[PDB]
Design a protein around this ligand. Structure first.
Ligand code: SR
Lengths: 105, 298, 372
């Protein structure tokens, strides 16, 4: 990740030329792991077998927050396709003028 | 003058730690056997002798581990350190040095003893036994050779000189010999004179996405094996180790280390054993090689 | 060491009953019990599918014949049960105890092969797709051992089932082996708690799923250093005497009075009469394997067809099996399509089994054939 900024659990961090190892001929689920107890380096990355997002409330309580952001599909040699995780925007009421939809409502 | 024994945690590597078992605080003394046992498979029929194949067998070296320490605390700290350091790495390379040679042996810890028969200021006198992985090999630097153009001589070289419009004479023996070749700087030979068994090459690639690595040719100019990699971006260098025990095929870009094994061409890499001939550089700008070649008795 | 859960025999005469009252109120099948003893599996040779060898391991607790052994690993295997749906499944090695000696060393048989035991299947069932055979084989109402569910990758078992010889009644073992050879897959039994949080039952399922729904072919190299064991297997049963001294009975004498006609199989695959040959020997085999055949003339009186003789002298599928140590540079797991390079020769096939021992981690590679 040459230059990728991520806001996980309201915590901002930048990935500057951070390389993560992958599994051959597998669908790798890249996770952003936040552990507040690890005061020196709280954010760590991991390529996993499945989407192991926990949703741990790190701001109010304790624990390690895991959240998938990228899905890397690989072959025997390298990477075949990359699909990023959807960015959910939970809202109560919208007062908008115009809208353009690429999928469906 | 006198011989030198040196235990190495990891030779050919950045994380090396050396213990002098000849001059240091912990010393090796009176090696059990440095020679060799051979089994020739000889069968005799009616007084006539027939010989099979010789299996050169290497025997366990048993040393006399001896620590020299100012206090009981010091010698206990020496035994805990030296042994764990041998245990920490899967195998340890013992260096044998004398006035004439500098051989190496790959060893594995077979047996170490700890007893309560302490000398003065609590000094150990124990037996350390090692298992032979590879006995006696030469770790040396392998470099390419350059070819230079021969000097131009009037009457001897092919030139149209002297009186116009030039002249070159056919003589007997002296006649005309070509000076050299235009752009002789293209010719380079990585000469292999004896059979080598493993190597630690530092390859610097040229173009990305174009297979980069090394290829080996025999005495007749035929390829027998090739370590080549097709990476997406230009690696700063590809660090390759052909050693069987800790095989490494990793690419480096900046401070990041990448495993290049799955990107490698598996068809071309037929053998590890390099034969008499030459080596070529595929898509490489620079290369640094360290060759290790075996010797049964030294 | 590894952790092992020891349960008493999963008797389907007990567990198949749908009397268990679910928290909502519904009546469902009886869930698996709690282990009678938690022990540690030691001095082990544990296979993943049991393709060639049977597992053997000494256990701390005194287990007896019939008991089910669940070997636990602190890792997870993701199986793709649907195109996009991937489920969190825990790594398990489930076996049935077949025999325990004096020194408590138990002979373990992989749950699936110990489940489809003594079951026979007629040709009528094998006429349909591979899904129909799997749905027949995996049934708790028939099998010696209890079964709760089956996970299966639709694409791999989508194809039409392999044709049966003589259209006879075959054992569940022989058909599964014949099917698993063509589909290039092997089954893995797994114990895991019910998917729904409401259902508190612990269940046993059979796995026919992979990490990729649409399996991709891998290209790798196997070095001589990995203690490689090369041996040749036969997928299809075809005859071994390439040359045939064929005799035809005379109608008038009702005897074999007439001289024999010799038939030779060429390198291409065709079968010709030996007398008809006009070549240089380059198109004929390197070794002559021969047999004498006796045939009875048909009701019409015509000699037996060339094609009928051809089937009996036709070659069998020579397949190469490679057993080697796990390479940490390029790991190869069970149920993966691979193209292995060994000593300058290319072999193509799949990873059938995996041995988890104290000393090494090894793989069984089966060359599927179908090269030209
Ligand atoms: Sr090394």
């Amino acid at each position: 990740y040459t230059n990728t900024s991520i806001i996980a659990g309201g915590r901002y961090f930048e990935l500057l030329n951070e390389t993560v190892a992958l599994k051959g001929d597998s669908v790798n689920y890249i996770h952003a792991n936040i552990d507040l107890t690890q005061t020196a380096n709280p954010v760590s990355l991991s390529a996993e077998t499945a989407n192991n997002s926990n949703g741990v409330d790190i701001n109010n309580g304790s624990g390690v927050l895991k959240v998938c952001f990228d899905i890397v599909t690989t072959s025997g040699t390298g990477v075949t396709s990359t699909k990023p995780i959807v960015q959910t925007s939970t809202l109560d009421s919208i007062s908008v003028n115009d809208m353009t939809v690429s999928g469906s409502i | 003058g006198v011989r030198q024994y040196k235990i190495h945690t990891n030779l050919d590597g950045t994380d090396d730690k050396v213990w002098d078992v000849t001059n240091g605080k912990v010393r090796f003394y009176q090696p059990s056997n440095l020679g060799l046992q051979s089994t020739n498979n000889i069968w005799q029929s009616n007084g006539i002798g027939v010989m099979g194949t010789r299996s050169i067998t290497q025997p366990q070296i048993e040393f006399k581990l001896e620590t020299f320490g100012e206090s009981l605390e010091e010698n206990y700290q020496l035994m805990k350190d030296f042994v764990n350091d041998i245990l920490s790495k899967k195998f340890v390379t013992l260096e044998y040095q004398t006035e004439i040679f500098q051989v190496y042996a790959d060893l594995a810890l077979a047996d170490v003893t700890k007893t309560e028969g302490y000398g003065k200021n609590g000094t150990f006198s124990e037996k350390i036994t090692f298992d032979i992985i590879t006995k006696w090999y030469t770790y040396e630097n392998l470099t390419f050779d350059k070819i230079q153009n021969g000097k131009v001589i009037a009457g001897m070289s092919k030139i149209y000189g002297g009186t116009a419009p030039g002249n070159y004479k056919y003589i007997k023996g002296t006649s005309y010999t070509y000076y050299g070749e235009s752009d002789i700087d293209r010719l380079s030979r990585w000469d292999i004179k004896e059979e080598i068994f493993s190597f630690m090459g530092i390859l610097y690639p040229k173009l990305p996405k174009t297979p980069a690595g090394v290829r080996f040719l025999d005495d007749i100019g035929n390829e027998y094996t090739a370590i080549v990699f097709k990476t997406e971006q230009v690696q700063d260098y590809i660090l390759i180790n052909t050693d069987v025990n800790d095989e490494t095929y990793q690419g480096w870009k900046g401070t990041t280390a990448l495993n290049l094994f799955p990107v490698m061409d598996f068809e071309r890499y037929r053998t590890r054993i390099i034969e008499k001939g030459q080596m070529e550089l595929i898509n490489l700008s620079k290369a640094e090689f360290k060759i290790k070649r075996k010797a049964d008795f030294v | 060491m590894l952790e092992a859960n020891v349960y008493d025999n999963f008797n389907p005469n007990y567990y198949n009953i749908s009397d268990f009252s679910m928290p909502n109120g519904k009546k469902e099948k009886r869930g698996l019990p709690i282990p009678k003893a938690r022990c540690q599996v030691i001095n082990y040779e544990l296979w993943e599918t049991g393709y060639l060898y049977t597992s053997s391991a000494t256990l701390t607790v005194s287990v007896e014949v019939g008991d089910i052994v669940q070997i636990l690993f602190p890792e997870v295997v993701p199986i793709e049960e649907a195109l996009g749906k991937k489920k969190k499944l825990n790594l398990d090695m489930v076996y049935l105890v077949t025999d325990v000696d004096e020194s408590n060393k138990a002979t373990l048989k992989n749950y699936f092969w110990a489940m489809i035991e003594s079951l026979d299947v007629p040709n009528a069932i094998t006429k349909t797709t591979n899904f129909a055979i799997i749905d027949y084989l995996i049934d708790p109402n028939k099998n010696n051992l209890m079964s709760y569910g089956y996970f299966f990758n639709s694409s791999i078992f989508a194809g039409k089932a392999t044709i049966n010889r003589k259209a006879e009644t075959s054992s569940a073992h022989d058909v599964a082996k014949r099917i698993f050879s063509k589909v290039q897959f092997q089954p893995t039994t797994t114990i895991q708690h019910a998917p729904s949080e409401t259902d508190p039952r612990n269940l046993l399922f059979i796995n026919f799923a992979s990490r990729n729904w649409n399996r991709k072919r891998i290209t790798t190299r196997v070095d001589i250093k990995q203690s490689v064991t090369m041996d040749t297997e036969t997928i299809v049963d075809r005859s071994a005497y390439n040359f045939a001294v064929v005799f035809v009975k005379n109608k008038a004498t009702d005897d074999y009075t007439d001289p024999p006609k010799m038939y030779i199989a060429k390198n291409n695959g065709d079968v010709i009469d030996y007398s008809t040959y006009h070549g240089d020997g380059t198109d004929l085999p390197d070794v002559r394997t021969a047999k004498t055949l006796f045939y009875d003339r048909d009701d019409h009186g015509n000699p037996p067809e060339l094609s009928t003789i051809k089937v009996e002298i036709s070659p069998s599928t020579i397949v190469t099996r490679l057993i080697f140590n796990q390479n940490e540079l390029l790991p190869l797991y069970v149920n993966d399509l691979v193209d292995i390079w060994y000593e300058g020769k290319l072999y193509s096939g799949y990873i059938a089994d995996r041995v988890k021992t104290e000393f090494n981690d090894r793989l069984i590679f089966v060359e599927s054939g179908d090269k030209p």
